[PDB]
Amino acid sequence: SSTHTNDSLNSSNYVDKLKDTHFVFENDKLPSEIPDVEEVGATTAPLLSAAYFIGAKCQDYNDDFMLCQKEAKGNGPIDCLKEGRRVTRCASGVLKDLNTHCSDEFRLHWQCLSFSNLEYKNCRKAESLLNKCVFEKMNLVKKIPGIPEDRQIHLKQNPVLKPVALHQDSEVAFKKAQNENSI
Amino acid sequence: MLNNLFDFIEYIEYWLIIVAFVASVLIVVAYLTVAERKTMGYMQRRLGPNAVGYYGVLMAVADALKLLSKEIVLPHNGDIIYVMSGPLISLFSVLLSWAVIPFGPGLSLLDSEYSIIYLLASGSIGVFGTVIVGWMSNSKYTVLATVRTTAQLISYELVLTTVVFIIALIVSSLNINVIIESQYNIWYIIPFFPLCLIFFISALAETARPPFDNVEAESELVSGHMTELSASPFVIFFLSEYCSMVLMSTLTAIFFFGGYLPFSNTIHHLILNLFDQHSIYYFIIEGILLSGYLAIKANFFMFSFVWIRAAAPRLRYDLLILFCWYVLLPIVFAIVVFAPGILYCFDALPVII
Amino acid sequence: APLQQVGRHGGPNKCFGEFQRVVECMTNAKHDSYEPCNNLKNDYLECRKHKVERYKAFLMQKHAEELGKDPEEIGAPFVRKRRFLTSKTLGLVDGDDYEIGVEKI
Amino acid sequence: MDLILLMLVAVGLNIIDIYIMIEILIMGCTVNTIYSASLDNDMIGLIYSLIQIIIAGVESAIGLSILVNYNRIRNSEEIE
Amino acid sequence: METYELIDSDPKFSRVVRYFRPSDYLTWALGTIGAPGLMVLFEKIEPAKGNTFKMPPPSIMRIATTIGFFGGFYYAYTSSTKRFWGYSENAKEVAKDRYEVKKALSEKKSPYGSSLLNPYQQDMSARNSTNSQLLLAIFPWFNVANHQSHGIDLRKYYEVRDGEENWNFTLPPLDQVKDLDVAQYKEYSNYP
Amino acid sequence: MIPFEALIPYAIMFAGFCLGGGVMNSAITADITKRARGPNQEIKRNVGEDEGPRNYTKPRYNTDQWDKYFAVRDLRLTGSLRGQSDNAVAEESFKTNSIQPYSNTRRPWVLRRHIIMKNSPTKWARKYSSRRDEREQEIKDDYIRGMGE
Amino acid sequence: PYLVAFRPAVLVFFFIRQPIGAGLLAGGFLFWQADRHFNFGIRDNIHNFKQTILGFPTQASKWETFKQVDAQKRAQLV
Amino acid sequence: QSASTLTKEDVLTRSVSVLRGFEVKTKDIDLQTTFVQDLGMDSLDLNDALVALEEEFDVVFDDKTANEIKTVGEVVDFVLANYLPTEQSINHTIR
Amino acid sequence: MNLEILDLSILGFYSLISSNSFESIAILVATIMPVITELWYNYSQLFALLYTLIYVGAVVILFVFILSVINEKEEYEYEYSGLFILILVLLLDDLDDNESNDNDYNNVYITDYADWFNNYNESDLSVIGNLLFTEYALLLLIISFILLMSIIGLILIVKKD
Ligand SMILES: CCCCCCCCCCCCCCCCCC(=O)OC[C@H](COP(=O)(O)OCCN)OC(=O)CCCCCCCCCCCCCCCCC
Ligand SMILES: CCCCCCCCCCCC(=O)OC[C@H](COP(=O)(O)OCC[N+](C)(C)C)OC(=O)CCCCCCCCCCC
């Protein structure tokens, strides 16, 4: 989707010229009555790499925040501020645990995603190492809901679609664990 | 200097990327004119151009420079609008069509979910620019050629558009890069071998190449729409026609032979394992490798354009109309119904991913 | 009831909810007349064109001119060129005024 | 300038020039539909725009055939 | 107005044909032979060529029979549809409808049937096909999908009427019947 | 007997494609990686000694609206549309550096300037007849009159 | 996007064939761009004249309504 | 549109002017005025006049009539009976 | 500088002075190109490409009819016009380009707020097809019916047989 909208950056600066777009800032903070919370600082590749561990850790808080939105009946962004702050802290907790427990395995996986158009199918080997490291240290298992456990695509032995280019670091790190862990 | 010099290159870097992109396409187009005569020459048991530059490598340069040093024929100096507007529309159309051709993953100037439509839409403008030459002209051979261009356009436009739509339907996407990456496990030449022939037949008719060279039929209309064109207006039309041959050859390689995907996955990994991925040299080699795969497949179809010219006689355009409307259209519209039925029967309707 | 105001991703768009509440009000059997649904009609039309909201901005701009208030001292800062959404303007710790890359993501 | 019907001078003096005016006039309706649909983020307007384009192309063909046969009627002797 | 009991506000194509009365088949035959017969009558009223009677060619009678065959079915389809809608007397069809629904409910199967369509498409299909028989004379459109928008409440099948005690159907609650809306959205409220 | 002279132009044509691909793959990938190093020029160009190997980011393709929101969100964190950061907590400046595009909603120029395309019964009414704008001005005036109640 | 490619071609050929017609058309085009860029207000005042004479609510008309309400509301408090 | 707008007085008046530009014995030309006697035209002069009168009225004398023409009035009779406006393009009439 | 204003200024000049039928078939193409580009850069790139795909095929068929009907009429004919009356007309026309008189709607800029709820993110053409082939399928099937009528209509008009 590359449709031009009025809510984000468009395709080119000729679109801005025709629309006379002004990129507007607001120097005011959130009002002091609302409690503060530190935002999530991870970018696209780390967040996609950590997506299924944030889901397996913040499932109760994610559902509660979304259920607040449904019960808000239009008054959404105001009535679920407290629930939203829980979601942000829980997601930051997972990213914090990744950088202390599985730092090399985590940074390996999202460096492959950056190398591979952010497609999960291109980085199975680094993902497998990260899944093994996270499960041992945080007891988090990636699960794709709605399907049997043995038909999950990330556990497929012989996938039809495979990356054309191989991430060299992932190949090296996969060999090292093969000869040292699965003797 | 230093810092200002270094970050000025960053300010101009993408323009050089485009200049290198333009230069790369013009080199293939220039040496396709040489390769056609060499290929026809040996098939005809002659040599072809080997006296202009070392082994004939400057023949394309000589043809352009000689034609660029020729007088332009027109009634008045202010009548440039007549015989220059047509060549420019034809050239701008085919050159803009190259904006969506990916030399590698994400290496296209334009990437969008409607790249397929842009490709078909851009080339349709070139058809318009050709007919403008016979703009109430007093040259009867130019006028006779304009009629034949419209007749050929009606023939191939429906078939060529529908064939590309079937390929887009199989992947459920109109992005050219997605279509290439969808051919990892299978090249569409195997499931759609009939469509590859039809696409190439349509390409020959679109480019006015033999056996469909009824527009520029020398034995019939001296030079067709080019009979009154000399010097620069003739180069631009000649340049655009050979640009279209390279484009349609590259599209045949993209729609049916996997685009830039390697012939052998094992060999592709072996070659790339020699270079450290933390060095910029890996990405140079990969760019050469992936474009080489595209170049090899496109070279074969550029060879096939020359090959069919040296083997088959010309077919009258009124027979081409009957061939496209009574034979090709019924077959292609059968496959546009065949293909979704097969996929639904086996629960394999495509999605974008 | 056919779908109206469908967003570009197939779901309801920004103004569907306003339209849906108008239909529910107009078709409710508890209403003697259509007077209760008049405010809901204005809300839906305001969602699309924002004509009253634009009119309020017209008054605020004009009222600020007559009292001599500076437009650049009471408004919101903005940047017109996308290439100059620089890290210094964004407020980053190691910010710079060099242009950002927008050529190819 | 519109109320004095300045558009009547911009239309050429052939029957085909009237056809072009009709196509341009209808194309103005579609551009207005696309503009409103995009601002509202409404796909129903874009479905309407697509319908207008297809239908406007149908009458262009039907009108052309009438003009084609009208010209044939004049060139009717055809002793050749 | 002589209204009757509503059976199905959008009867499925198979149900309409199955519920044809012997007269509906009779009218289907009359339509099929009424078209060749009218071609004979029109010739009898006034010969097409000259002043003497001439039987129309067999090719005309072939296409006429086909036109009458479709016309006879459309008439019979609209005759049977009115009974489902309650516009026409449908006492026999109510008894047959109640037996089939109660039989399916006791088996914990949907009275409407399982569908390949997702919740949106079932709803969309009902929107397209409901009341479409009012224009069946202009262009055809039939309900060939298993949707749940039939304009009826399945609780009315849980009261035994006169002449239904010998059926002895034990009906479970509606939340145990497979492929019904009230027994579909168990875990998520936006997924069946 | 393979004629090598005839195969020479194909070799140059082959090298023509390789020139485009070799430059485009490396020049674009290097620039994306260079601009992902930090928010200023002294970090993008210079290489620290304590830093590890350079990991490269390849060009992106087949994007959607989420990738546009991600690109702007990355810019507010790193100064690049494809910046890299896995910090669990953002900087303080991220809380107040949101970018909101404000644009006009006027009809296309071709609609309101083409000599023929701008003429229709409803366009003349919108442009020359005050009947529509009189009614809609009443709605705006009610907004300020009703403030007191 | 095709107007970006064609515009240099059409403009130069337009000046070659009709230099006086092109200069007059291009000169008027630049003059209005100078009116908008440098806030001469000539096009705005013509627009304000058209609305006044055709009975539309002008910018001054809408501001007069606000001032009439403002004086009415203040006295309602005082 | 596709009908003649000719009167006997105009055709005679235009015929006299076209005949006045030649070398004729008398300038007093009426319907009864003969070509051989009154105006004095030999074989070639007469056919120069006929073609000149053809171009003026956009008519073409048939061979049988032209060889047998005697008087000025015969020409006026011929033009009135045979003149037709030339067909126009498909756009001249309906537009 | 919005250069589309200049393009329409030239197009309006050439529509007033156009004489023959070839110039009219060029005014059409000189109109679709500004439409396609402005749709591409402002509102809808999908419909910018749909315009190119459909209108070009109509343009060439339109052009080929000009060849069969060109009838010598307007090459040798004369027009008077006057350069002063042309430019004055275009100046008065250029003065009023406000198609709408809602000043606030034309002057005050607006924005939209993005949301992350749409995780199934596809193109506008997929949603258009999703609705056109499901909810407005009747509209599609009538359009198919009208296209069939044109096929029969063109034959019964043009074919001598
Ligand atoms: C690659 C660039 C191609 C175009 C470069 C040439 C520039 C010429 C004008 C191009 C279009 C600008 C607007 C013109 C609309 C058509 C009006 C016309 O009749 O063409 C103008 C051309 C000049 O003839 P001229 O002598 O000045 O006037 C007649 C004097 N009795 O009279 C002619 O008949 C010559 C026309 C030649 C064929 C042109 C076909 C149209 C191509 C349009 C493509 C670009 C779309 C328009 C973009 C600019 C919009 C203003
Ligand atoms: C379902 C599977 C589809 C198969 C896919 C391919 C479809 C092709 C259809 C061909 C039919 C045909 O050649 O038609 C022939 C027609 C008209 O011939 P006619 O007047 O009817 O005489 C023939 C009828 N006889 C023999 C029964 C009496 O014109 C031609 O000579 C077309 C010649 C096309 C040659 C183009 C060269 C392409 C080279 C490609 C190199 C890579």
Short mmCIF file of C-alpha atoms in Angstrom, two decimals, chain D residues 31-63:
data_model
loop_
_atom_site.label_atom_id
_atom_site.label_comp_id
_atom_site.label_asym_id
_atom_site.label_seq_id
_atom_site.Cartn_x
_atom_site.Cartn_y
_atom_site.Cartn_z
CA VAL D 31 -11.87 13.45 -11.15
CA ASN D 32 -14.31 15.02 -8.69
CA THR D 33 -15.37 11.55 -7.52
CA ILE D 34 -11.77 10.38 -7.04
CA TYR D 35 -10.90 13.57 -5.15
CA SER D 36 -13.79 13.22 -2.70
CA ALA D 37 -13.34 9.48 -2.20
CA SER D 38 -9.63 9.84 -1.41
CA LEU D 39 -10.19 12.63 1.12
CA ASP D 40 -12.92 10.65 2.88
CA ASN D 41 -10.92 7.39 2.69
CA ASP D 42 -13.99 5.84 1.07
CA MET D 43 -13.69 2.95 -1.37
CA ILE D 44 -17.34 3.27 -2.45
CA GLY D 45 -16.44 6.49 -4.25
CA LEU D 46 -13.55 4.77 -6.01
CA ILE D 47 -15.88 1.96 -7.07
CA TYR D 48 -18.11 4.70 -8.49
CA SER D 49 -15.11 6.25 -10.26
CA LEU D 50 -14.22 2.90 -11.84
CA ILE D 51 -17.81 2.42 -13.02
CA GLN D 52 -17.86 5.89 -14.58
CA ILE D 53 -14.66 5.19 -16.53
CA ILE D 54 -15.96 1.91 -17.96
CA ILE D 55 -19.38 3.34 -18.82
CA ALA D 56 -17.91 6.52 -20.35
CA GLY D 57 -15.78 4.30 -22.58
CA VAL D 58 -18.84 2.36 -23.73
CA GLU D 59 -20.68 5.42 -25.05
CA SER D 60 -17.48 6.59 -26.73
CA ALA D 61 -17.52 3.38 -28.79
CA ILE D 62 -21.27 3.51 -29.49
CA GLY D 63 -21.05 7.12 -30.63
#
